[PDB]
């Protein structure tokens, strides 16, 4: 389900609990039109792929997590497998989001 | 001098008062490493070019202005001449910022 992240602690704990699973993180902001547009599709992907963990990090709630992960653009999707960042892109491209999930799972 | 913008009213008023002058607007966020890095250089450009107006808009203070202007990335520089947007780029590239100011003034 999309797990809403509200601290650096919660983010680190989620990346540890995932084990072997792909984690897809949506970095979003309330002021981005692109971030809102893709947010229902992000949520449908989490009901479609049960074996992938989907996290949401609002960059204004979690400014230390946004700065640590070096987010530049809104939205940014970063992909992690066992604590290592294994992919990243920015922009609201639905096809590329699902295509990267399939490449990486 | 870099004029700090804290409302949509203030932004619209500044773009009207500039008359014929180039206006360079820095859209920044506190969570962006790139936005902090370029911020002293942005400020030196405003003491170097007296005939250009330099505005700063923090995207979390002014979320309606950030959403109207369709800011995607941090920092974004938009350039305006007589209320019309005449250029834009994102990223902390010092040389390209000054080079665009020279192309447009």
UniProtKB/Swiss-Prot annotation, chains A, B:
Coiled coil: none annotated. Induction: Up-regulated by ionizing radiation. It comes from the Eukaryota. The active site is at 32 (nucleophile), 35 (nucleophile). Disulfide bonds join 32-35. The keyword Cytoplasm applies. PROSITE patterns: THIOREDOXIN_1 (PS00194), THIOREDOXIN_2 (PS51352). The modification N6-acetyllysine is found at residues 3, 39, 94. Changing residue 69 to S: No effect on reducing activity, interaction with APEX1 and on S-nitrosylation of C-73. Retains interaction with APEX1 and transcription activation. GO terms for molecular function: protein homodimerization activity; protein-disulfide reductase [NAD(P)H] activity; protein-disulfide reductase activity; RNA binding; thioredoxin-disulfide reductase (NADPH) activity. Keywords: Acetylation, Activator, Allergen, Cytoplasm, Disulfide bond, Electron transport, Nucleus, Redox-active center, S-nitrosylation, Secreted, Transcription, Transcription regulation, Transport, Ubl conjugation. The modification S-nitrosocysteine is found at residues 62, 69, 73. SUPFAM superfamilies: Thioredoxin-like (SSF52833). It holds the Pfam family Thioredoxin. It is found in: Nucleus; Cytoplasm; Secreted. Residues 2-105 form the Thioredoxin domain. PANTHER family: THIOREDOXIN-LIKE PROTEIN 1. Participates in various redox reactions through the reversible oxidation of its active center dithiol to a disulfide and catalyzes dithiol-disulfide exchange reactions. Plays a role in the reversible S-nitrosylation of cysteine residues in target proteins, and thereby contributes to the response to intracellular nitric oxide. Nitrosylates the active site Cys of CASP3 in response to nitric oxide (NO), and thereby inhibits caspase-3 activity. This is Thioredoxin. It comes from Homo sapiens. The lineage of its organism: Eukaryota, Metazoa, Chordata, Craniata, Vertebrata.
